C-alpha cells in the first residue's frame, strides 16, 4: 500500500467514471488512454476518445500521448515534457506526480504536495536508509535508470555515456562518503 | 567426347558476345552496303559478307567484328566436320549434320531463314531489316546451335 497519489487525487480519479479503475498507476497511465478519457470527460467537444486505443504498444503510447500534447498546446496547458517522457516510459513516481498536476490544473485546487520538482530519481536515499549497505552495481543502476523502452525511443550513444559516467561518479562519491560514515 | 562439348561452349560464348554487339554488326553491315552501292538485295549469304569485309571496309572495328563472325562460321564448320568424323549414327543425326553443313555454306540462300522464340535476334532489329535487309545473317548461328544441341542429345542416348 504505497500509492503515492494523495487521498483527494484518488477521490477525484474515482469521481470521473473511468472505464476501468487503475490497479497499477504506473503501468495503466503509461498508455495515456485513462488521461485521454479524463480530458474527454472534462472537454467533450475538443477530444474524441474513439481516436485513442487502449493498447500496450510503444508506438500506440507515443501516438496517444502525441495527440495529448497537441491538445494541450491547443489548450495552452503547461506540463513538463520530462514529466510526460517519464510517464511514457513508466518511470517510478512520475505518473503519480503527473496525475497530481492534472488534478491541480483541472480542479484548480492546490495540494500539500510532498514534492514538486524533480525528486530523487534513483533509490540512493532508499538504499542508504536500508541496513546491510547495498552498494548496487553499475549494471543495477543502469537497469534502474536506463530501460529498454527509451533506448528504443531515442538512441544517442554520446549523451547516454555522459549520463552513465556522471552516475558512476555520483556512485563513487557516495561510496566514499559511506566509507567515511563507517 | 569432352572436346566437342568444350568447343560447343566456346561457340556459345562467342555467340553471346556477338549479339551483345549485334547492333554494331548491323551498323557495320549498313555502312558496307552504303559504300558498295548495294542497298536493295538483302544479305543472305556468307560470301557477300566476306566480299564486303575484304573490299568495302574502312573501319577497323567493322573488320574486327566481321572477322570474328567469319571465325564463328569456321568454328561451326570445324565442329560439323569433327561430328561427321566421329561416327554415322541414326538417319536423323545424319539429316541434322547435313542441314547444318548446308547452313554453314559460304554460298547458301538465307533469305527465308528466320529465328523464333526464345531467340530474340529478330526482335532486336526492326521487322523490315529482318525481312529484306538482314534476316538470315542474324538468324543463322542460334538455329545451328539448336541443331548442334539436338544432335548431341540424340547421339548421347545411343
Amino acid at each position: 500500500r504505497s500509492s503515492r497519489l494523495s487521498r483527494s487525487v484518488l477521490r477525484w480519479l474515482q469521481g470521473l467514471d473511468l472505464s476501468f479503475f487503475p490497479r497499477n498507476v504506473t503501468r495503466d497511465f503509461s498508455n495515456g488512454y485513462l488521461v485521454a478519457e479524463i480530458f474527454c470527460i472534462y472537454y467533450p467537444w475538443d477530444l474524441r476518445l474513439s481516436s485513442f486505443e487502449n493498447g500496450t504498444s510503444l508506438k500506440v503510447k507515443l501516438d496517444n500521448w502525441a495527440q495529448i500534447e497537441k491538445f494541450l498546446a491547443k489548450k495552452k496547458f503547461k506540463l513538463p515534457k520530462e514529466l510526460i517522457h517519464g510517464t511514457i516510459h513508466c518511470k517510478a513516481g512520475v505518473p503519480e506526480i503527473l496525475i497530481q498536476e492534472i488534478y491541480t490544473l483541472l480542479t484548480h485546487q492546490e495540494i500539500r504536495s510532498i514534492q514538486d520538482d524533480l525528486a530523487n530519481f534513483t533509490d540512493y536515499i532508499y538504499q542508504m536508509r536500508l541496513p546491510l549497505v547495498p552498494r548496487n552495481t553499475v549494471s543495477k543502476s543502469i537497469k534502474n535508470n536506463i530501460r529498454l523502452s527509451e533506448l528504443l525511443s531515442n538512441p544517442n550513444v554520446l549523451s547516454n555515456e555522459l549520463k552513465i559516467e556522471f552516475l558512476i561518479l555520483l556512485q563513487m562519491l557516495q561510496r566514499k562518503l559511506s566509507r567515511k560514515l563507517n | 567426347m569432352n572436346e566437342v562439348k568444350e568447343s560447343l561452349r566456346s561457340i556459345e560464348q562467342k555467340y553471346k558476345l556477338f549479339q551483345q554487339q549485334q547492333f554494331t554488326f548491323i551498323a557495320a553491315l549498313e555502312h558496307c552496303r552504303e559504300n558498295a552501292h548495294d542497298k536493295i538485295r538483302p544479305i543472305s549469304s556468307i560470301e557477300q559478307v566476306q566480299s564486303y569485309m575484304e573490299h568495302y571496309c574502312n573501319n577497323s572495328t567493322h573488320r574486327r567484328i566481321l572477322i570474328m563472325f567469319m571465325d564463328i562460321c569456321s568454328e561451326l564448320s570445324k565442329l560439323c566436320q569433327h561430328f561427321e568424323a566421329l561416327h554415322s549414327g541414326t538417319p536423323v543425326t545424319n539429316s541434322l549434320l547435313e542441314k547444318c553443313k548446308t547452313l554453314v555454306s559460304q554460298s547458301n540462300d538465307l533469305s527465308s531463314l528466320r529465328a523464333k522464340y526464345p531467340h530474340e535476334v529478330v526482335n532486336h532489329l526492326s521487322c523490315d531489316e529482318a525481312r529484306n535487309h538482314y534476316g538470315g545473317v542474324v538468324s543463322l548461328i542460334p538455329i545451328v546451335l539448336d541443331f548442334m544441341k539436338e544432335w548431341i542429345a540424340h547421339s548421347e542416348k545411343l
Partner: protein, 432 residues
C-alpha cells in the same frame, strides 16, 4: 460454426501441443502432407473444430505458438508434422527467458504481444462464432507462465463471453527445474485465481511414478508424458469432437464442476494404464474401469485425495457399453465410501458416455474430478514462498527490472486467504 481456437506457450507447452496435434491427426486420419487419408464417418462433419476449410480440402491447424526463444521453433518444425502448421503463428523473440516471470512480462511482453494479439484477433474474426480458447503451457519458466497469464487476461478483457481452460504444469518440491520456481508459481497463482475460468493440475513426477510402477517402461521420457497428456486432452474434448448419446461441452462442465470461482482447479486422469505384457490379458468391463478411476494409484497427482473429501466428480466415458452400470457403481460407491465425499451435497458424480470409441483402442474413459487434495501443495507452496521471501533471497533480479516487492506481499496474502478458505470448506459440516 462452433470452433475452438488453440493457444501455445512455453517450450513444454509447445512440445505437448505438438504431440496432441500429431495424436489427433493420426486418430482422425490426417497425413503429414496435409491432405485427408481417413476412413471414418464422424471425421469429416465436425472436423472443422480444430481445422479450417481450404481449397483441395487441405485442412490447416488453428493454433498460435508463442515463445521468446527461436530455439524451440526449429525443434518442432523438424518433426514429422512440423511442416503442416502456420509459420506466421510462430511468433518468437530475440532474447531468451532465463526463467524470470517479471521481466518476461515486462521486457519481452510489451513489443512482442502486439503481433500475437493481432493474429488471434484475425483468427477469431475468421470464424463465425466461437466457444473459448485453449492454452497449454507450464509454470516452469518465464515463457509459459510469463505470457500465458497476460494473454488470457487480454482475451478475457476483449471477449469475456468465452471459456478459459488451461492445463499448466504445477511444480513439485521433489522434482524441480528452476531455483526461483516458487516465486513464479506464486505470481502465476494470483492471475490463475483472478483472471481464469478453470485450470487443471499437471505434474511430471506423478506421471513418472505411474509409468514406472504400472506401465513398467524401460527408458520413459518426456515423449511418453506428452502422449499421456494428449490422450487425456482428446478424452476430455471428445464430448464435443465426436458426438454420441449423452454429449457435453466445456462450459457445462465448468459450471457444474465448480462450486466457487475462487476454486477452479481439478484432477484429470485416464483409466487403462497397463503394461505391454498385460495388454493381451485384461477383462474389459465396468467395475474395473470404476476401480481404476476411483483409486489413488492411477491418478496423476503428487498428493493423496484420501486426506480430504470429494467435492465434484465427472466421469466421461468413451465407448459402447451402457448407462445402468455407471449409475449403480456410483450409487454403491457413495453408499460404501461415505467418508470421502461431501455429505451435504448428494450425487456428486456426473455421468458422461461417448458412443464414438477412440482410434486404436476400444475402451477409453477419462476422470475429471475436484477432490480435496491440492491443499497440501498449496500449503507447501505458501511455506516455501514465505521462506524464500523472509530474508529476500534472489530478489535483486526482480527488483532491477522495475517492479516493486509489494506484489509478493499481496500474492502471499491472497494465497493465505485461499488456503484458509480451502481448509475451512474442507470440513463442510452439516450444521452446528
Amino acid at each position: 460454426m462452433r470452433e475452438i481456437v488453440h493457444l501455445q506457450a512455453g517450450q513444454c507447452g509447445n512440445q505437448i501441443g505438438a504431440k496432441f496435434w500429431e495424436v489427433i491427426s493420426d486418430e482422425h486420419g490426417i497425413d503429414p502432407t496435409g491432405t485427408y487419408h481417413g476412413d471414418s464417418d464422424l471425421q469429416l462433419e465436425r472436423i472443422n473444430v480444430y481445422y479450417n476449410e481450404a481449397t483441395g480440402g487441405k485442412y490447416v491447424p488453428r493454433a498460435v505458438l508463442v515463445d521468446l526463444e527461436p530455439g524451440t521453433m526449429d525443434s518442432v518444425r523438424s518433426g514429422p508434422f512440423g511442416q503442416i502448421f502456420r509459420p506466421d503463428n510462430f511468433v518468437f523473440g530475440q532474447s531468451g527467458a532465463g526463467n524470470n516471470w517479471a521481466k518476461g512480462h515486462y521486457t519481452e511482453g510489451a513489443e512482442l504481444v502486439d503481433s500475437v494479439l493481432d493474429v488471434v484477433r484475425k483468427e477469431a474474426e475468421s470464424c463465425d462464432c466461437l466457444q473459448g480458447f485453449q492454452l497449454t503451457h507450464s509454470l516452469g519458466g518465464g515463457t509459459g507462465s510469463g505470457m500465458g497469464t497476460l494473454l488470457i487476461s487480454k482475451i478475457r478483457e476483449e471477449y469475456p463471453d468465452r471459456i478459459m481452460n488451461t492445463f499448466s504444469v504445477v511444480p513439485s518440491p521433489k522434482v524441480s527445474d528452476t531455483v526461483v520456481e516458487p516465486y513464479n508459481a506464486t505470481l502465476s497463482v494470483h492471475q490463475l485465481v483472478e483472471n481464469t475460468d478453470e485450470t487443471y493440475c499437471i505434474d511430471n513426477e506423478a506421471l513418472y511414478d505411474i509409468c514406472f510402477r504400472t506401465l513398467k517402461l524401460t527408458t520413459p521420457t518426456y515423449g511418453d508424458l506428452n502422449h499421456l497428456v494428449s490422450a487425456t486432452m482428446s478424452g476430455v474434448t471428445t464430448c464435443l469432437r465426436f458426438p454420441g448419446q449423452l454429449n457435453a461441452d466445456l462450459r457445462k462442465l465448468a459450471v457444474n464442476m465448480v462450486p466457487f470461482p475462487r476454486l477452479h482447479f481439478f484432477m484429470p486422469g485416464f483409466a487403462p494404464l497397463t503394461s505391454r505384457g498385460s495388454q493381451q490379458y485384461r477383462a474389459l468391463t465396468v467395475p474395473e474401469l470404476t476401480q481404476q478411476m476411483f483409486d489413488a494409484k492411477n491418478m496423476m497427482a503428487a498428493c493423496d485425495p484420501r486426506h480430504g473429501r470429494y467435492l465434484t466428480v465427472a466421469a466421461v466415458f468413451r465407448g459402447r457399453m451402457s448407462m445402468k452400470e455407471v449409475d449403480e457403481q456410483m450409487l454403491n460407491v457413495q453408499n460404501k465410501n461415505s467418508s470421502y465425499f461431501v455429505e451435504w451435497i448428494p450425487n456428486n458424480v456426473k455421468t458422461a458416455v461417448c458412443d464414438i470409441p477412440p482410434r486404436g483402442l476400444k475402451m477409453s474413459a477419462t476422470f475429471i474430478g475436484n477432490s480435496t487434495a491440492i491443499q497440501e501443495l498449496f500449503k507447501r507452496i505458501s511455506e516455501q514462498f514465505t521462506a524464500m521471501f523472509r530474508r529476500k533471497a534472489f530478489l535483486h533480479w526482480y527488483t532491477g527490472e522495475g517492479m516493486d516487492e509489494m506484489e509478493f506481499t499481496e500474492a502471499e496474502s491472497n494465497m493465505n486467504d485461499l488456503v484458509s478458505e480451502y481448509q475451512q470448506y474442507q470440513d463442510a459440516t452439516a450444521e452446528e
